[PDB]
Structure formats: C-alpha cells, structure tokens
Amino acid sequence: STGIDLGFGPGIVMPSVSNHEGGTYVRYNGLGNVDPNYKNLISKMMRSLIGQIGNKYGYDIDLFDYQGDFLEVFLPHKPSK
Amino acid sequence: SWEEESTGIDLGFGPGIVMPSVSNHEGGTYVRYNGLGNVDPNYKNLISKMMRSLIGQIGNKYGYDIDLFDYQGDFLEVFLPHKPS
Numbered sequence: 001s002t003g004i005d006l007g008f009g010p011g012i013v014m015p016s017v018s019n020h021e022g023g024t025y026v027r028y029n030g031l032g033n034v035d036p037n038y039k040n041l042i043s044k045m046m047r048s049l050i051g052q053i054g055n056k057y058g059y060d061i062d063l064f065d066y067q068g069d070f071l072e073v074f075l076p077h078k079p080s081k
Numbered sequence: 082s083w084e085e086e087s088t089g090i091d092l093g094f095g096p097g098i099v100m101p102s103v104s105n106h107e108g109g110t111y112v113r114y115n116g117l118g119n120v121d122p123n124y125k126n127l128i129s130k131m132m133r134s135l136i137g138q139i140g141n142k143y144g145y146d147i148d149l150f151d152y153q154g155d156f157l158e159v160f161l162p163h164k165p166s
Contacts, residue, residue: 011130028131038090049135
C-alpha cells in the first residue's frame with residue numbers, strides 16, 4: 001500500500017490554494033474517513049506547526065477546523081506588525 | 082451503530098496534546114515533534130505529507146526555505162531558516 005487514500009490516490013495529499021483580499025487559504029479535504037482520534041491529532045499537529053511558524057516569522061497564520069471533511073489554513077498577506 | 086472511545090492520543094504531554102521542542106543551530110530554528118513512536122504509521126506518514134505540503138506553501142509565499150526532516154522514526158522535525166531565500 002502506497003498509504004492512506006483521501007480520494008486522490010494512495011498516499012496523495014492535494015491541497016487547494018486560493019487568493020483572497022486579506023490572505024491565502026490552503027484547504028485540505030478528504031478527511032471524512034479519517035479515524036476520529038487521528039482527525040484530532042492531525043488538527044492539533046497542524047495548529048502547533050503554524051503557531052511555531054507564526055512565532056518565528058511574525059505572521060498571524062490561522063487554522064479553521066469545523067470538525068468535518070476538511071481543514072483550511074489562512075496565510076495573511078501582511079505581517080502582524 | 083458502533084463507535085470507539087475518542088479521548089485523545091498521548092504523545093507524552095497528556096491526552097490530545099501536541100508539544101514542540103525548539104532549538105537554534107546552523108542557520109535556523111529546529112522544531113521537533115517527539116513522542117510519535119506509537120502513532121499508527123499510516124497516519125504518521127499522512128501527517129508528514131500534510132506538513133511537507135503546508136510548509137511548502139508557506140515557504141513559497143513568505144520566501145523562506147522551510148524544510149521537513151522525517152527519518153520514519155519517533156519524531157518529525159521542521160527547519161525554519163533565520164534568513165530568507
């Protein structure tokens with residue numbers, strides 16, 4: 001097995017990236033058939049990672065997890081200061 | 082009809098908690114996520130691939146050569162360079 005299939009093929013992760021007035025959204029879908037304990041782990045890991053990157057470089061990167069089929073990361077165009 | 086317990090995976094910091102360990106070395110900050118030895122390896126690989134994709138998008142946008150170090154062991158490590166590309 002080349003790994004978990006989220007709907008894009010074995011082992012494939014394929015975000016959609018879109019440009020908005022205030023920043024860029026990076027959306028990861030296909031999370032509907034992820035184990036509930038690991039859906040939580042994925043969300044907590046991504047939240048920690050973007051907090052560390054934001055701490056280092058000064059951007060208010062944010063994560064939206066409405067407990068469904070997808071996660072979305074917001075990358076502001078401008079630094080916080 | 083069936084549903085399992087969803088209390089939270091414990092990586093060593095308490096159920097459901099993720100903690101980084103942060104250090105500074107040759108040209109950047111290293112962020113190490115320890116405690117992954119008992120994570121289902123199928124999900125560890127998915128998390129690694131999602132992290133690699135996300136740091137690629139972030140590094141492209143903001144102009145830093147952020148990288149991921151994965152040895153298929155009990156940690157994942159992200160490198161955040163001090164200076165832009």
